[PDB]
Design a protein around this ligand. Structure first.
Ligand SMILES: [Cl-]
Ligand SMILES: [Cl-]
Lengths: 299, 299
């Protein structure tokens, strides 16, 4: 365990391009430090003097991973069998994704000649479900019918319910009895010169690698969190409080049945930002790549 | 070479969770597509129909790497030997970094009793250089002396010149003859209850792994760019135009003089976003992690 701590310490020093940790010294007073990192927006400070890094690159990494778990699907409407009906055949991708972050229906309201009278019209979207036939109110929206424009119909929860039912098919009847009064018309089939006005459904959805537990020799990640306070480094390391020193252990079966050998290797790496005294007078905010191992696998 | 293309194709399909590429079909008309990805801000379109991804996760990755090459240094002033002089001993970190992105001097103007008369005072910062003694005008700034507040003195180019001269020492004489007229005083030594007003210099600076060239067997990255147009995939792949299929080749010396074996392994991975037809009706924008290999090394 002391050897592990020494190893982690050497690792940190190497990534910071330091030959050793800074000598102890009476540093710049804490008030000065906090004020400086506050004004430069380097570190946000709560009361009692707890410091977090304001522009943490690790948070950006987590955000990127969120994007990596998120897919955006554009489904163009197919003509329905009935009048004023659209068919949406959502890709199987949406079935793999569990959480519906957002879903919109885009319909283009075409107003050939501008009309101020009856400025606003009520558009309704009915999901045609069977078991014989009943209609769900997908969306009831009041829109402006002054000029030709796109209109957006939020249908998040309804698409969520649809996917939860294990379905990716969606037939939509559209109703707008006041539309022609305003001299307006909903482009339901993007045909010919109005083909750039073909309606569509947008769907942004999320989806929601061994760790060493009791696994004997297989390639896995051992989690070893080490607080800087416990290893006597919290004097020159301002932030964060600790370091997730996860590492890859185990052996990997070869390609014997390119390269034959296989190694237990970090397959998922996360960057980490640090705020520290380089000496008694110099505080450094630094962003280090490949600092934290998130997953291990066989090469 | 056809086997390499097949390998890349299989790789892409695997990362997209597809068993094979989508069957050809008469897709949704290009006008509809472009309009849809434009309105949803999924893909920016120039004329002639060239498509780029608007929220490319790869660009975010490049930005993160820029942060990983950038350090921010806070140097607190030490008392000079002369009157109204501050000494800045910049960390050696700044010497490693070549490009000075920005540098500021923060000085706190303390106005005990508010004074509207002589609203503005001229503060000058003189860098005291020798070879006997001459003074450079670091900064000449006109500031408001109504209330006690911080003032920021841009010194980017001057700190750049200092670092270019291979020096990290900086003595600054400060002049403000109009300050006491306005009942103001520059906190030069953050002492006692004014210790949170200790002046400081901020410095944000940048710094500015084998590739297979003719290296026989050492671990390196082979660069293989493949355009989707040339491999007949540009019909269902809307963006980007091609794929940097870089890969790791070579052998790695062992740890014989943990794990003994070492493998040529991607040490630096970059994520890539794709915009593609899942079928004739469904366009998917997806962000894939660990898609592009940027560097290879021995594990
Ligand atoms: Cl130590
Ligand atoms: Cl093919």
């Amino acid at each position: 365990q002391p050897e592990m701590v020494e190893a982690v310490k050497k690792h940190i020093l190497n990534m910071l391009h330091l030959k050793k940790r800074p000598d102890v010294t009476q540093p710049v007073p804490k008030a000065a430090l906090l004020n400086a990192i506050r004004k430069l927006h380097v570190g946000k400070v709560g009361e009692n003097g707890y410091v977090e890094i304001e522009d943490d690159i690790g948070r950006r990494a987590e955000m990127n991973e969120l994007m990596e778990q998120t897919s955006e699907i554009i489904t163009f409407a197919e003509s329905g069998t009935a009048r004023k009906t659209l068919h949406f055949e959502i890709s199987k991708e949406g079935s793999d994704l569990s959480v519906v972050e957002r879903a919109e229906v885009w319909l283009f309201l075409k107003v050939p000649k501008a009309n101020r009278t009856r400025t606003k019209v009520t558009i309704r979207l009915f999901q045609q479900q069977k078991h014989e036939r009943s209609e769900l109110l997908l969306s009831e929206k009041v829109v402006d019918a002054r000029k030709s424009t796109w209109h957006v119909f939020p249908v998040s929860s309804s698409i969520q319910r649809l996917l939860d039912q294990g379905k990716s098919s969606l037939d939509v009847r559209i109703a707008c009895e006041q539309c022609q009064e305003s001299g307006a018309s909903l482009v339901l089939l993007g045909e010919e010169k109005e083909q750039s006005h073909r309606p569509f459904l947008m769907l942004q959805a999320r989806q929601s690698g061994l760790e060493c537990d009791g696994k004997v020799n297989i390639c896995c990640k051992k989690q070893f969190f080490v607080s800087f306070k416990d290893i006597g480094w919290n004097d020159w390391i301002i932030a964060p409080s600790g370091y997730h020193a996860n590492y890859c252990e185990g052996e990997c079966p070869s390609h014997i049945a390119a390269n034959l050998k296989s190694c237990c290797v970090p397959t998922k790496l996360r960057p980490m930002s640090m705020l520290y005294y380089d000496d008694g007078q110099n505080i450094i905010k630094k962003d280090i790549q490949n600092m934290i191992v998130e997953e291990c696998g066989c090469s």
